[PDB]
């Protein structure tokens, strides 16, 4: 999931449904391949002993300073207008510096974001609508002009940018326990036999 070559844009973020398998989280925590790792409502050591019915792994790329806006009941541009975490979100957050892959000489505009929206996005909501944003009451009709702007904006990516603004690939796992039976569980032991 995190090893995938290309990730979707903050507005284009893909949602992967993971179920019916076993999950080993000790390799991700002890691999030291993540820049920052934090969980909400559940400890990392307890995940191995807990079975979850559905696990959603979010994928997208955001600015370094924008990672702080990912959390239950947060604010900001990326949180409200792009991706937001509900107050009850039990999942975890993972990020690492992509400046060695995504960022290239000349800049990479493939990763964009939604700058303006008429309101704040709802929890776990994805809107790809490219419709022009109307600031005032002046009609737009898809033609850029006064009080008419294009909401999507491209993240500037170059290796010479500061570490704070370096692109970080974030994988958000959504842990939700529903009435359906549980499948995904932690690893096993299988000690010696006597």
């Amino acid at each position: 999931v995190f090893n995938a070559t290309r990730f979707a844009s903050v507005y284009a973020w893909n949602r992967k449904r993971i179920s019916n398998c076993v999950a080993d989280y000790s390799v991700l925590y002890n691999s030291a391949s993540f820049s920052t790792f934090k969980c909400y409502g559940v400890s990392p050591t307890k995940l191995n002993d807990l079975c979850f019915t559905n696990v959603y792994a979010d994928s997208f790329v955001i600015r370094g300073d924008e990672v702080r806006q990912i959390a239950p009941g947060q604010t900001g541009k990326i949180a409200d207008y792009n991706y937001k975490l509900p107050d009850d979100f039990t999942g975890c957050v993972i990020a690492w510096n992509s400046n060695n892959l995504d960022s290239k000489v000349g800049g990479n505009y493939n990763y964009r974001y939604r700058l303006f929206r008429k309101s704040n996005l709802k929890p776990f909501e994805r809107d790809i609508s490219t419709e022009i944003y109307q600031a005032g009451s002046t009609p737009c009709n898809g033609v850029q002009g006064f009080n008419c702007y294009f909401p999507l904006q491209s993240y500037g990516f170059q290796p010479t940018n500061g570490v704070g603004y370096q692109p970080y690939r974030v994988v958000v796992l959504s842990f939700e326990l529903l009435h359906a039976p549980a499948t995904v569980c932690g690893p096993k032991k299988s000690t010696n036999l006597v």
Binding site: L115, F116, A135, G136, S137, N147, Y149, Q153
Partner: peptide
């Protein structure tokens, strides 16, 4: 509706 909202919007995209 007020010009303030329109001004802050022009400043954010600028």
């Amino acid at each position: 509706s007020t010009i303030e909202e329109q001004a802050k919007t022009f400043l954010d995209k600028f």
